[PDB]
């Protein structure tokens, strides 16, 4: 069996300098660090952990072998994997199988070698889709009753893990870190607001500043992208059929109108709905000569490229991630990462301390389940809100906050513990 | 029995003239009249009310009158009503009992005054503060079985419905509103974002800009406040004990720190934590001269007023509702409404939009409760999402906003009903 | 002749305290004070002042007298005295001759009982209006010679001062502050931004967020609005004439287009222009209903008041200053403060700290006339930008600003004093 | 003689594909062809320009042209040339001499190879510098009585042009429009404000909210740095020499310190002063650890590179124009651009909207000296306001706003033309 497997373990020199940066920008993850390198709480556990390889997983993944884990990795996308992360956290000792460019054979094949430790197969999953967790429930059953728990951070993750207990196919504990709100808030709208502007500029380098910016959704990835937006000086147009959600665009001074009536309008299009038909060939045919389009909501469904692809006269590719289409109508359109995510195809995804959100998440439910089993009944679970402010906690040294603290008398007055959970389930923030 | 009692019956004109110019920004209000007039859905229903009868209040009677119901109201504060408003109720010819300056007996008295319409005793109740609800189940169990619901907006209110519950002594269902979004949002972010300026100034007509604005609490209220003086030019600091909360503050490029620290810096003060010993002597030692203090939050516990007047060299009222105070140290603190929420004495309170998304919900409620017993067993029942949309919709028409529909391939795709709900349980907003 | 002449001089001990809180918002009167009261520079000048005869004009006043000069004082206008204010200074044996409501003879007569003193005729003249000016021209030439210098602050003034030069009537060196920069800043853009909600609001208490405001303008004035109403969630529009105001708008994302659009769209309009005819009857009958309207621009001449007047087949007064016009159409309009100012008839004006700026402005040109007589010649002069520079640098220390100070090596390079002027003349901040 | 020299001609389709994208993003210039191709107002011009052969500068180029005027070009910088844009200039049969990392020996020989045309020597100067300007006066005297006019667009120029008047030395009537409004805004302001973080991005990809930005400086670059950052959610801090400006920072709610303060606490140091010794090793060794440090303002004499240089334990690039120092102390620095402009060296420069109002701004000047000479003695002449209006206007169209035409009644009125200048020449916007 190979220790690990990566592109070039030669890059993890450079791998380690990028570490060594990102972890200044990920202090919920160092925050764990200093707080459990010494009572070490993951002691025994084998955690075989499938998600992106980048450098900040890496970090992750350090935090973790750190609180007293043993842990072996795999990407959870065949192009996610930034080889030089990938080669120091292989230098390092750590069985980790990804590079960029795998194919669905060997991508498939990297999630298996981490399932058997050096003394044992995995008994905790550390997953992101969901794949690793489908796996081993569909491949290797005969693993399901020696894992004791699983730590999910995605949607697609979370709505499969409750088909699977709909189904009464999950055998294994699963925490939910996707709807924590320190995951959720920096996953889906500080992340893209510190993106979508990121994305466009590095691909078009237009101004902002004046444009007509129209933005379909007005969820957290929308509400993140209009404000960044709206900090350039555009004119950010919303559009939305949830009438809650559109209703705080207009608490806010946001144009909320359809798409059908925007098209004529922007000169910027944003995606952010999660749902298909968003920007069709009418709305194409409706657009300003060279409107820029992207999308940063769900993979490529939301605009309707195919249409472009099917019906320009033109098609001229400006530079990687953005093409030039021109239409019977003589008008061009700009389209963006081939209308995937724009903030991944123009530009380098989420910054490292929105990802240090997220994992300190993974972590949190990694601890929580390795030592709490006696508390999670197969099924899925939110996680605790106590840890949830942890998270939160964990990333207020870095920001140099100063955060209150109860006296007895006032947390008697307000029901309430000294250390929290300070808010009730249905709190929304 | 007197068929009502207010005032002066002569300031009808008056009260009509308000709510005529109210209309017009309750649009949740008027949706409900154009949209079920002709069908009378609370028809036999026979309401008794016990909520602030002010212009606001008076459109939601006359609402539920043209939704087919009988309606008996009493205010829920013996401060709370506008004469003009009651008197503009009482000349329609709807069974009012409320007015300005009531007394502990004279308040008893007007909830008890709408416990028995003409041809029997109440069938509904609409509560704002669990008055009306404990002086039935308390002084009139007897007509407790007749009650088909209850509806309740404030937190207090439900969560008395909820020790009621809990012992067994809530003998009627009832469904709260106060954790609906639409309701929620504009009761304490959306609304105290519109008013603690306005009540601030009204007080000092001081100029905001270039001042610092210590915010204590960064929940709903704190960032509506933080957000109003951003706006107006104030450099805003947050004090917070919730990591989350505070972690959200600092996303927005608020200092958060501790009042103990922002006590020496802020020119203007505001709590709204809905927590006791906020703003403390020592804290008023340190502040600078003429300093700004007000409580947008819980009632008056959060700021020691108690200490100021029994420490202060001097209490110089400079006009209704505003004090400045001179301490030993020779600097002045200026207190506004005497320590109790600034919006209410020293501005007109909530704008009628947002008491339109508070009474909308009530509205909601009762033909809930009225046309769907069945789905409601005795206990506390939260308004469905679908609902809670419904009242954001029934706004967007005056907002002029155009709703996008989504067409049964979206629907489908996302496995959501073209009309929804369109957002899980969960979900935050 | 009269020591003064007051509407009641009991008021000064009301008009007392109002000063004292005022004087906290006037730190560079305050400033001016603590660094003159000793040298005195104003010693031998006899200060005729024609000037709003409010409190913070007061604080004007007393800043004088402590600077070494004799003032006697009248009001610029027949009704913006505030008694309260006039008799603290009649009370201080400062010979004031205002109050709110005086006929034209009696305005008249006011600002000439401030011609002699004690000693003999004025020898300075600070003024608001020209009227001080013209006065001593037309009816007092014989004075002109003994006078050494005028300080104007308003556009009128200047204008005027500028007709004077031109026909060779001006006789008496002018420096005009109306142009300083932080007079200019203070007067037009935060001081209407302090004001412009805080009118609408005491008006009609309506909720701004999600309301289309329409700007007609965007100077300064304009600018302040604009960015107050941005503030506060509403969707603003501007209408421009200057393709580099508007410009400028649209790099701030408003949208800019004609009144003849707009007044279709607006639930509030503001007029800033300085123009006339901006809202006129074919705007007013595409209105929707209840669209607020009003003026913060020039006098009275930007909406067609006359035509509402002439058209509306109801007038109802909502309150002072608020009347409710129903049109042929069976819309209604919302006209606040019967077309004129808003913030001076729906609010109470400038914050005092704007009018610091503004007044500490008039100081120091008294202080640079009265000085450096040898300095100037007969004509119009705008402020010297070191006093400028001088005035906002008395407001920082309120401010708790630390001001960087240029080392000598940095002066050297960047070819300027150590205090200044910073900046070329055309500078345009 | 070499009719161009290029870096390789074979980039011209790849510029001219730039190009195509550039001309959407410069309606200014797009309006003058549209305008004026058919009437040729350049005609007989044999126009020399010194400007960054950059894609934007190309367009202005071609603008020329279609003008009516020759043209033969060169850059004002060894490095600004982008040679694609050069390219496609010199296959369009125009004389450009220009490629990115010439040798001053072959800058200066770029430049002579354009004073002389095809068939005779130049007759107009465009300049961005002086260079040109000083060339032709000191090495070409003999050319100087056949050239009509010069304009200059930068400070250096502009500052220059004055000595040399100043001196007798200039010889041919020049138009500054550097001080132009259109210009200078979006060249000082708009323009840093579009770039600031997005060369930060590229640079680091670190996260802006949360952080607290430290920008030396509130002229132009410094409000539009502190804009864009205040946008993304970072806490910013202003240092200024300026009274003024350091008031205007404080009434936006910035708190103002010095930098001896701030350098403490910033995350992220920008300066744009123009001025030396900004930020020292004294700031540097109290600076937190991996503090973001940067220039936007005057090429690199802002910050003491070379202190960083004589004292850091190591300095490590962590890319091109990206350096990371580690101190005694232990922390690091993380330099951006080396101390040069970060917005040249880690992003795109200005984007070409902005670039499109100074360049438009010049070929304003250009046709004003070549059409009415008689207007201009020797001597820098700032661009006539009316013609920095018709910049602005010439944008209004791309951004789709709809500017308003004064009455006949209304320009009476205000005592100006319908077409402008509609402000005084001392109006600061
Ligand atoms: N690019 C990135 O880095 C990220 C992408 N995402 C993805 O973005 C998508 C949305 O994410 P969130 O904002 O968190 O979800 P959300 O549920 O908060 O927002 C989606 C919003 O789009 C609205 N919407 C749905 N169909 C619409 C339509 N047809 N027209 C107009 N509006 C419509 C919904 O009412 C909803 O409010 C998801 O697919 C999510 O997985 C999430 C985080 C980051
Ligand atoms: N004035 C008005 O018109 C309104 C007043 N309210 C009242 O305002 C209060 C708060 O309401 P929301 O903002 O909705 O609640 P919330 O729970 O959203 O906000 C309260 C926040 O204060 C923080 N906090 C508590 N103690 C603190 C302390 N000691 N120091 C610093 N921060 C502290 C909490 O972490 C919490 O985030 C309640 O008493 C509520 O009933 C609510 C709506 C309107
Ligand atoms: N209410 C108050 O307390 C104050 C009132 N003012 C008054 O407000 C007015 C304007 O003041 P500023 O903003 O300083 O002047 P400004 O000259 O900076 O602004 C006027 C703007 O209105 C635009 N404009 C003119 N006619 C227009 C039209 N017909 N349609 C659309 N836009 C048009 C102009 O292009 C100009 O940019 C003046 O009359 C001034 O005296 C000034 C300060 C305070
Ligand atoms: N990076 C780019 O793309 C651009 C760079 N610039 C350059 O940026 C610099 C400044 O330009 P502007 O903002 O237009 O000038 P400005 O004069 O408007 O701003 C400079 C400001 O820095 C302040 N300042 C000077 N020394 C200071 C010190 N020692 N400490 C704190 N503050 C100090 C001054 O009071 C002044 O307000 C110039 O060198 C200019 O040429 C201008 C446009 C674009
Ligand atoms: C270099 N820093 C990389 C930080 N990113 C990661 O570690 C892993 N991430 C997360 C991420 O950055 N984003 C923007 N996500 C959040 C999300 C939620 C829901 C749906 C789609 C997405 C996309 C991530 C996710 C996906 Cl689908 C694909 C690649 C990913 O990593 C990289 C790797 C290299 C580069 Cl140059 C940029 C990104
Ligand atoms: C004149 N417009 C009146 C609109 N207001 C109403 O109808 C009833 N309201 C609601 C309200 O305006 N606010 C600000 N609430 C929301 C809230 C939630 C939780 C705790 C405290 C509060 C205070 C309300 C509530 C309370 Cl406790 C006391 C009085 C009230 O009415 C008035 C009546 C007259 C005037 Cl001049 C102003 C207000
Ligand atoms: C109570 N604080 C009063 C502060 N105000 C003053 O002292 C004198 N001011 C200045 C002022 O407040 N504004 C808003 N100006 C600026 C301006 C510039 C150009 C054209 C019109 C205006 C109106 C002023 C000017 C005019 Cl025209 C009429 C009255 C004035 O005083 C008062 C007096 C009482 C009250 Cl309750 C409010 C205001
Ligand atoms: C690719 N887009 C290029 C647009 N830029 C240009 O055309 C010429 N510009 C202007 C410019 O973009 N900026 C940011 N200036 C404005 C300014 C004013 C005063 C002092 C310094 C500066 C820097 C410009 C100026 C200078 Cl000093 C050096 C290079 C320049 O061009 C480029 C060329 C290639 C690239 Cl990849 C980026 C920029």
Redesign the pocket.
């Known amino acids: 069996k190979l220790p690990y497997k990566v592109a070039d373990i030669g890059l993890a020199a450079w791998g380690r300098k990028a570490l060594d940066i990102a972890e200044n920008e990920m202090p919920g993850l160092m925050r764990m660090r200093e707080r459990y390198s010494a009572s070490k709480p993951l002691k025994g556990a084998r955690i075989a952990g499938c998600l992106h390889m980048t450098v900040e997983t890496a970090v992750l993944i350090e935090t973790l072998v750190t609180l007293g884990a043993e842990v072996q990795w795999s990407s959870c996308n065949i192009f996610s994997t930034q080889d030089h992360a990938a080669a120091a956290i292989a230098k390092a000792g750590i069985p980790v199988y990804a590079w960029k460019g795998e194919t669905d054979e060997e991508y498939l094949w990297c999630i298996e070698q981490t399932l058997y430790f050096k003394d044992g197969p995995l008994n905790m999953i550390l997953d992101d889709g969901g794949d690793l967790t489908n796996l081993i429930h569909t491949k290797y059953p005969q693993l399901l009753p020696g894992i004791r728990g699983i730590s999910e951070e995605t949607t697609t993750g979370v709505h499969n893990l409750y088909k699977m207990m709909a189904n009464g196919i999950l055998k294994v504990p699963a925490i939910n870190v996707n709807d924590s709100v320190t995951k959720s808030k920096f996953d889906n709208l500080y992340g893209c607001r510190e993106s979508l502007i990121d994305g466009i500029k590095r691909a078009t380098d237009v101004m902002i500043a004046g444009k007509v910016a129209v933005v379909a959704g007005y969820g957290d990835v929308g509400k993140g992208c209009a404000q960044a937006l709206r900090g350039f000086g555009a004119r950010v147009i919303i559009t939305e059929i949830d009438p809650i959600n559109a209703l705080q665009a207009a608490m806010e001074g946001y144009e909320v109108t359809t798409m059908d009536e925007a098209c004529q309008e922007g000169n910027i299009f944003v995606t952010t709905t999660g749902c298909i038909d968003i920007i069709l060939g009418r709305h194409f045919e409706q657009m300003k000569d060279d409107a820029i389009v992207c999308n940063i909501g769900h993979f490529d469904v939301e605009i309707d490229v195919k249409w472009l692809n099917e019906n320009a006269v033109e098609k001229v590719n400006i530079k990687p991630q953005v093409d030039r289409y021109r239409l019977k109508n003589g008008r061009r359109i700009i389209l963006l990462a081939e209308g995937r995510l724009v903030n991944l195809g123009c530009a380098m995804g989420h910054p490292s301390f929105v990802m240090s959100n997220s994992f300190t998440n993974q972590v949190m439910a990694q601890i929580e389940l390795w030592t709490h089993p006696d508390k999670y009944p197969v099924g899925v679970h939110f996680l605790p809100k106590k840890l949830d402010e942890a998270v939160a906690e964990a990333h207020l040294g870095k920001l140099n906050v100063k955060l209150?603290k109860?006296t007895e008398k006032?947390a008697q007055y307000?029901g309430m513990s000294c250390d929290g959970p300070?808010?009730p389930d249905h709190?929304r923030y």
Chains 1, 2, 3, 4 share one sequence.
Do not use: H
Request: glycine share 0%.
């Open positions: 209150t109860l006032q307000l300070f808010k709190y």
